[PDB]
Amino acid sequence: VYAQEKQDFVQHFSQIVRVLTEPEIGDAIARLKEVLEYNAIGGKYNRGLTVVVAFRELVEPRKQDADSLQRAWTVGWCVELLQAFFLVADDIMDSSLTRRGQICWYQKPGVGLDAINDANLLEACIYRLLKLYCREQPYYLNLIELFLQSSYQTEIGQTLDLLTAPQGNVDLVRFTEKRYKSIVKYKTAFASFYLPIAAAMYMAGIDGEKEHANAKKILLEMGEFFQIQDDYLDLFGDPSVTGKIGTDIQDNKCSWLVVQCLQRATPEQYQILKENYGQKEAEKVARVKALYEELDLPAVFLQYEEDSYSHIMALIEQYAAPLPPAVFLGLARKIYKRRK
Amino acid sequence: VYAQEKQDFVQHFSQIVRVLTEPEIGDAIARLKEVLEYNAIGGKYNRGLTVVVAFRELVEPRKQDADSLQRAWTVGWCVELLQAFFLVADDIMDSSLTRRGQICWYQKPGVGLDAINDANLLEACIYRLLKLYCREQPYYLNLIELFLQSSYQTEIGQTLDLLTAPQGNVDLVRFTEKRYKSIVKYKTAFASFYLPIAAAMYMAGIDGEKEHANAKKILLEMGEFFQIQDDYLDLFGDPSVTGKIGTDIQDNKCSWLVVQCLQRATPEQYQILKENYGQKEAEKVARVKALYEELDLPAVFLQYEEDSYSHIMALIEQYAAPLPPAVFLGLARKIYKRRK
Ligand SMILES: O=P(O)(O)C(O)(Cc1cccnc1)P(=O)(O)O
Ligand SMILES: O=P(O)(O)C(O)(Cc1cccnc1)P(=O)(O)O
Ligand SMILES: C=C(C)CCOP(=O)(O)OP(=O)(O)O
Ligand SMILES: C=C(C)CCOP(=O)(O)OP(=O)(O)O
Ligand SMILES: [Mg+2]
Ligand SMILES: [Mg+2]
Ligand SMILES: [Mg+2]
Ligand SMILES: [Mg+2]
Ligand SMILES: [Mg+2]
Ligand SMILES: [Mg+2]
């Protein structure tokens, strides 16, 4: 049922590539196809599926014609492309090794830093699909501005993420709960959680500022939880399941884990963290992981996950109306107690 | 008069930064200001000035109110930002050392590959300025789509540029006039020449497909000449004037110079080019430069420049109407016989 919905969405990718890859310029188009095939496939497709599922739940079935449904999974694929663009660039800036069970696109021999332009192409494909399928719709401009604003919000979050994580500089003093909340709100919460539901809302004709603000209250909080889970999985997740190798400790990141470590550490443990964090040495990384386990941070995360799920459920009860609670409940079911 | 126009446009940059850089998120905004100050200033401002000059020449002066003029130099600064975004990324992918008389932004200690996200921020600022100043104008959507399409065209050209220039692989067979024309049309001609004039045209209410197609005929040809001049300057330009160190030979680029070399080379000279092109060794680079001089390529360029200027002038006579010829003549005067 949920895997059947996933299969139906993935089966539309062949048409997405086809319409995007329709002279000497043919070699560039062939490279775009390779870029699309490598970087837009292999994930969970939760964002793209959220557009499709929310649209169906928000639009009267007698208004869900063949062209309307096609626009909905096209916009779903635009959200996947936005995610693909940010991940290709993020893997370069985070010096990552693997993504979605395979070597990072930039790590491929013959790709390297050309992946910067490939990431820009993925971003360009969003607006090509919006023009091709939604140009005559009343929500066209609302969708363009939403994808543009979501990109700006993500980039500002990425800036905060990279600034708080300087290579070669100890930045323990900046690893506060307040800084953490700000980074994750902008780098992840806006584009991974608000964007898919707000896109389906605009397509359903729900353009009201108050309805978008109420949806935002639930979704930004859901996004914060999702990034916290991502930070936990960076170190304590199974790479065969997650499809990626963690780098947060080596990269001196303001991870949820380092924030929690600092709140619980003795002065002796603070020194261990200071001497071993944000460095390439495997033994220094192993020393930080041992400290996190000593401070029962996996147990602290399990308790956080329980408290956060109840909080998000309380926000759904307060702010879902007049939207069907299932719109938010479906997405919460998908991400809570997730190990991928 | 022309330098006075330049000074007037540059004097608006302080307001552009101010409105773009208006919580923990303040550190990211401070980084955006640094990114804007470093990368949007130091050039010739020909693209931004073209928007301002063309708008004034296309709009009736009794319709050029204070807000209308402000929108025109704002859109001029959007074109400068588009240029800044592509240059920050291009300098990483081309392994460049200097730009606009200073070290490339990514070469700065403490910047590095974080410059990828900085380049994305510059791109985001275009749509922030368009929303802030042109959202209520009838040409708002035409401007958004024009900047989005110009970016896609540039990125597809960049893809062709990088594909024809593989590191560690001889690609002499692909350095044809046909391939060269395709690369430069997409990577430079569309966004550096069509984009500024088409933006001013849309702001003047000139949205007709036929008028935009005629303008495009002149401007894409002007853009091809401009890229040819850029390729000539990469090797034979004065770096104190150009503000940048050439890398085309080391980067195995499909430069206009290598295309002309291949058309004139004997089998003995073809071998010298094959053994020495696309490599880091300074003596191999010096050997290629000696071959170009032996084949009188600076004289071939001077003759090309004369023939091209006459051709572009013939295109202005055929396609300028009903637009004032001065719109195209001003831009042609600015770029012809340029050494910067
Ligand atoms: O997949 P990743 O690399 O763990 C991540 O979530 C990717 C990402 C990229 C851009 C914005 N938000 C998340 P990160 O933040 O680098 O921890
Ligand atoms: O300024 P540059 O680096 O000489 C150049 O013109 C810059 C550039 C970047 C993107 C598109 N067009 C030109 P390039 O093409 O790399 O020779
Ligand atoms: C914004 C986040 C935290 C990055 C990864 O998102 P996902 O975990 O949803 O990765 P994919 O399913 O798209 O592969
Ligand atoms: C698209 C081209 C060939 C790259 C440089 O353009 P400019 O020579 O106009 O550089 P700036 O004036 O903006 O510094
Ligand atoms: Mg990462
Ligand atoms: Mg990251
Ligand atoms: Mg992570
Ligand atoms: Mg370059
Ligand atoms: Mg280049
Ligand atoms: Mg050049």
* Per-position DSSP letters for A118-136, written without gaps between them: HHHHHHHHHHHHHHHHHTT
The answer to whether B42 touches B83, Cβ cutoff 8 Å, is no
3-state secondary structure of B52: helix
Q: Give the helix/strand (H/E) hosting A333.
A: helix A326-335
Confirm or reject contact between A89 and chain B (CB < 8 A): yes
Q: Ligand 2 — pocket residues by CB below 6 A?
A: B 86-87, 90, 94, 96, 154, 158, 187-188, 230, 234, 244
String of DSSP letters for A243-299: -S---TTTTT---HHHHHHHHH--HHHHHHHHHHTT---HHHHHHHHHHHHHTTHHH
CA pair distance B39, B23, nearest whole angstrom = 25
String of DSSP letters for A171-229: -GGG--HHHHHHHHIIIIIIIIIIHHHHHHHHHTT---HHHHHHHHHHHHHHHHHHHHH
CA pair distance A146, B127, nearest whole angstrom = 11
* Beta strands B102-103 and B98-99, pairing class: antiparallel
Whether A93 and B110 lie within 8 Å, measured CB to CB: no
Please name which of A154, A129, A122 lies closest in space to residue A39, comparing C-alpha atoms: A122
Q: Is A94 annotated as a binding residue?
A: yes
The CATH class for the domain spanning B1-340 reads mainly alpha
Residue A231 designated active-site? yes
Phi, psi of B99 (to 5 degrees): -155, 130
Q: Give the helix/strand (H/E) hosting B263.
A: helix B256-264
- A232 alpha carbon – ligand 7 mean position (Å): 8
| Catalytic residue of the set A91, A118, A230, A251 | A230
Domain ranges of chain B: 1-340
Residue of B82, B91, B94 best suited for mutating to test ligand 2, as the one with most atoms within 8 Å of CB = B94
Which amino acid does the sequence have at A118? Answer: D
Please name which of A256, A215, A213 lies closest in space to residue A234, comparing C-alpha atoms: A256
Q: Which residues of B are catalytic?
A: 44, 85, 90, 94, 99, 161, 187, 226, 230-231
Structure determined via: X-ray
Binding-face residues of A in 98-157 toward B, CB within 8 A: 110, 112-114, 116-121, 124, 127-128, 131, 140-141, 144-145, 148, 151-152, 155-157
Residue B223: Cβ within 10 Å count: 24
3-class DSSP string for B59-102: CCHHHCCHHHHHHHHHHHHHHHHHHHHHHHHHHHHCCCCEECCE
The answer to whether B305 touches B297, Cβ cutoff 8 Å, is no
Residue A336: Cβ within 10 Å count: 17
Kindly compute the dihedral angle of the four CA atoms of residues B193, B194, B196, B199, in this order, to the nearest 10 degrees. 180
Whether B160 and A27 lie within 8 Å, measured CB to CB: yes
Tokens of B229: 């001049």
CA pair distance B224, B222, nearest whole angstrom = 6
Contacts of residues B292-295 at CB distance under 8 Å and 24 or more positions apart, as own/partner, are B292/B235, B292/B257, B292/B261, B294/B269, B295/B260, B295/B261, B295/B264, B295/B265, B295/B269
Which residues sit opposite A103 in a β-bridge? A98
What is the biggest distance separating any 2 CA atoms in chain B, rounded to whole angstroms? Answer: 66
CA pair distance A257, A246, nearest whole angstrom = 13
Binding-face residues of B in 318-337 toward A, CB within 8 A: none
Q: Which residues of B carry a binding-site annotation for isopentenyl diphosphate?
A: 44, 47, 83, 100
Assess whether the C-beta atom of A232 lies below 6 angstroms from ligand 1: no
CA pair distance A307, A241, nearest whole angstrom = 25
- Min Cα distance A137 → chain B (Å) is 13
- Min Cα distance A167 → chain B (Å) is 8
Confirm or reject contact between B61 and chain A (CB < 8 A): no
Tokens of A233: 């999985």
Considering only CB atoms, which chain A residues are within 8 Å of B151?
120, 124
The answer to whether A182 touches A151, Cβ cutoff 8 Å, is no
The answer to whether A150 touches A190, Cβ cutoff 8 Å, is yes
- B27 alpha carbon – ligand 8 mean position (Å): 30
**Who's near B111: CB < 8 A, 6+ residues apart?**
B105, B118
CA pair distance A194, A51, nearest whole angstrom = 11
How many Cβ pairs within 8 Å bridge chains A and B? 123
Tokens of A214: 């109420």
Assess whether the C-beta atom of A214 lies below 6 angstroms from ligand 1: no
Nearest chain B residue (CA) to A160: B28
